[PDB]
Amino acid sequence: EEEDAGLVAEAEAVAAGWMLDFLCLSLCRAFRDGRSEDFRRTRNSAEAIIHGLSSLTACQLRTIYICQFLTRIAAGKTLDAQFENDERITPLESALMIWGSIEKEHDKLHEEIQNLIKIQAIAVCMENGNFKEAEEVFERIFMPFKSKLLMIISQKDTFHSFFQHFSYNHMMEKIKSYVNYVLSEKSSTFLMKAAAKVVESKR
Amino acid sequence: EEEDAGLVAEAEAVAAGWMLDFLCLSLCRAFRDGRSEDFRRTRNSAEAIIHGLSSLTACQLRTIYICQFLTRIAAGKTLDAQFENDERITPLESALMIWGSIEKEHDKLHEEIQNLIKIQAIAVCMENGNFKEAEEVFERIFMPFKSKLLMIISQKDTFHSFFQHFSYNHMMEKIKSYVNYVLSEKSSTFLMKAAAKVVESKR
Numbered sequence A, B: 001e002e003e004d005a006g007l008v009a010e011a012e013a014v015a016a017g018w019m020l021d022f023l024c025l026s027l028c029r030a031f032r033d034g035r036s037e038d039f040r041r042t043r044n045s046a047e048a049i050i051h052g053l054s055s056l057t058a059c060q061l062r063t064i065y066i067c068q069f070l071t072r073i074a075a076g077k078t079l080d081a082q083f084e085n086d087e088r089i090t091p092l093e094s095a096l097m098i099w100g101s102i103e104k105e106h107d108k109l110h111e112e113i114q115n116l117i118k119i120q121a122i123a124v125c126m127e128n129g130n131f132k133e134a135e136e137v138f139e140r141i142f143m144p145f146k147s148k149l150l151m152i153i154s155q156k157d158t159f160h161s162f163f164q165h166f167s168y169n170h171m172m173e174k175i176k177s178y179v180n181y182v183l184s185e186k187s188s189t190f191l192m193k194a195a196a197k198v199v200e201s202k203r
C-alpha cells in the first residue's frame, strides 16, 4: 500500500518527463512555423507541467531553459513583460541570461545569436522611444560594436542603418536555425515517436 | 511538406489525448488521497492541455467532465468561486449540473451522490450565514426531503441533525467510491501503462 504509492509517484515522474520533451518539441515547431496562438497555448501547458516536477536531470534543465528562452524571444518586443524578480530586466536581457546558461556548444551560431540578442535588446528600447532605458540596458550588457551602440543611443538614431544589418528578423532567422537542430534531436523522444507510429499505422 | 505538417498535427492530437487520460488518472488519485496541492497543480495541467485540444471523442468529453466535476467538489465550500457564466451558480450546483450530463450508468451510487450534492449545496450556504442564498439555491435545485430542507432554511437551523446524517464527509466518501471505479478503468491507459512498465523494469 505504501510501496505501491511510491511506485505510482515514480511512474508519474516518468510520464511528466515524457510530457516535458513532447511540449518542448511542439513549442519549438510552433516557434519555427510562426504559429503564435499554438505557441501561446503550448507554453501554458509546458509551464504547468514544469510546476508538477521536482528533481530534474541535466537534460531536463536544458529542455526547460530552451522553453524559457523561446518564451522571452517571442515576447522580446513586449517591454511591459517582467520575466525576472528584478523588474528592470527586459525580455531580451532575460533571453541573453538563459542563452549563456544552457549547457550547449559555443559554435559560430551560438555567438552570432548572442550578439544579435545584445544589439536588439538596445534597438527595441530605441524603437519605443525609451532612450534612457536603452542606455541602462547598454550598461548592464556591455570595443568596436560597443562604441557604435553608445553613439547610436546618444544620437537617438532609432532607425539607424546598423539595426538594419543586425535586425530583429535576422535574430529570429538565426534562432530558427538553432530551433531546427533542437527539433531534430528531440524528434525521437518517446511520446512523439509513439504518436507518430499510431498516425502512420492508420494511413 | 504540407502533408508532413498534417501528420505532425495529427500526432500532436494523439499525444494530447494520451496526456488528458494521464492527468485525469493523477487528478482522481490526488482527490482520493486528499493530496490538495498535487490536485491543484494537476488541475492546472489538465486545464491547459484541454485548451490545446479541439475535436473530442465521447470518451474524451466524459474524461473532461470528470475532471471538471472533481474540481467543483474540491471547491464546494468556496462560495467566492464562479464556475459558470451565470454568477449566481454555486460550485456544488455546478458539480450537480455536470453529474447529470456525464454519459454514465445511473446506479444506486449515482443517485446517492446526486442527493448528497443537493443537500450539501444548501448546507454550505447555511454554514456561512448565507440564509437568503440557501433559499435561492433551493429554488434552483428543487417531496419529503424537499419539505424538510425548506423548513431547515426558514428556521435558520445551520447545524441541523439532517445535515449530520447527509454530511459533507458522507458526500466526499461516496464520491471517492466512484473515483475508485474511474481509477480502475483508466489504470490501463497508454501513458500510465508505459511509465509503469519502466518503473517496474528498474526494480
Ligand SMILES: O=C(CN1CCNCC1)Nc1ccc(F)cc1
Pocket (backbone or CB within 6 Å): A043, A044, A046, A047, A050, A064, A067, A068, A071, A083, A084, A085
Ligand atoms: O519563464 C518562466 C518563469 N521562471 C523563469 C526564471 N525566472 C522567473 C521564473 N518559466 C517558464 C517555463 C516554461 C515556459 F515554457 C515558459 C516559462
Ligand SMILES: O=C(CN1CCNCC1)Nc1ccc(F)cc1
Pocket (backbone or CB within 6 Å): B043, B044, B046, B047, B050, B064, B067, B068, B071, B083, B084, B085
Ligand atoms: O472548469 C472548467 C471551465 N469550464 C467549465 C464549464 N463552464 C465554464 C468553463 N474547466 C476545467 C477543465 C479541467 C479541469 F481540471 C478543471 C476545470
Ligand SMILES: [Ca+2]
Pocket (backbone or CB within 6 Å): A079, A080, A081
Ligand atoms: Ca518595462
Ligand SMILES: [Ca+2]
Pocket (backbone or CB within 6 Å): B079, B080, B081
Ligand atoms: Ca458567491
